[PDB]
């Protein structure tokens, strides 16, 4: 379950305030709703978001200057004091009627991860980004990665030929 | 895991000859283990695609090869592709070239080489798993640390493409 590009457009158009800012951050980083919602300005360092320890290990995810500007400038302490999750959830559910109960906190994370793989991302990198302790956790997104078996030709150490010359 | 560098591959192919050299090229092209490459028959090579059948611990899979590789290995239109393979000589030659090769691993050194260079060259570890016939990605992850490091992929590849849309 994830939001298509069309659904993302509809969602960001129907959200407002800190809710829309949190959505943008989750779609940009794979954050769960909760860890996005409790972000503080001191957790943004040189356009890199730290999700501090909870129960999860700390991890860091880069964001663009544009996103950092939107969510953090001229703000101190908690970035999103006017977060409104039930309102977010109702809007989400209007956009995605087949969303299972309670998964509104993770849909945007699933959207991040799914599009990351569709777009050509590495499952290894996604694991680190999501904070998964095991690759098996991340493999739920693996079927979204295109498999081009002719990579065996172009990427092999002979570049698809029969010859290798020395220095 | 011990793999051959590009230089070592060049030394190896120059030192090998005949069917051994052909098998080495095929392993370097497909990730094949020595054994499954050496027992290939004409029927396993159809229109530039090599089929490696199911074994005790690896999946069946079909791996594409270039016309040039196909032309090199498809002389025999019937029976074994490489009837004059000589694993002991191949193994000796490999060990002289790569003296720190762990015992027993001459059968897999070219597979490790394929896989390692595949990842260095930007290959998807998920496609590699399929090519090698690994049942679990955990087996393929031994090559993961060779993947190129892109510290900003979360920006470039998220559905907003780094924007606020």
UniProtKB/Swiss-Prot annotation, chain A:
Q: What is any one GO biological process for this UniProt entry?
A: DNA integration
Provide the alphabetized UniProt keywords: DNA integration, DNA recombination, DNA-binding, Hydrolase, Transferase, Viral genome integration, Virus entry into host cell
Active site positions: 32, 106, 109, 132, 141
Domain of life assignment: Viruses
Which residue range or ranges hold the Tyr recombinase domain?
1-154
Record-annotated membrane-spanning stretches? none
- Tell me one GO molecular function of this protein: transferase activity
What does this protein do, in the record's words? Integrase is necessary for integration of the phage into the host genome by site-specific recombination.
Which family is it part of?
Answer: Belongs to the 'phage' integrase family.
This protein is called Integrase
Gene (UniProt): int
List the range of the whole protein covered here: 163 to 330 of 337
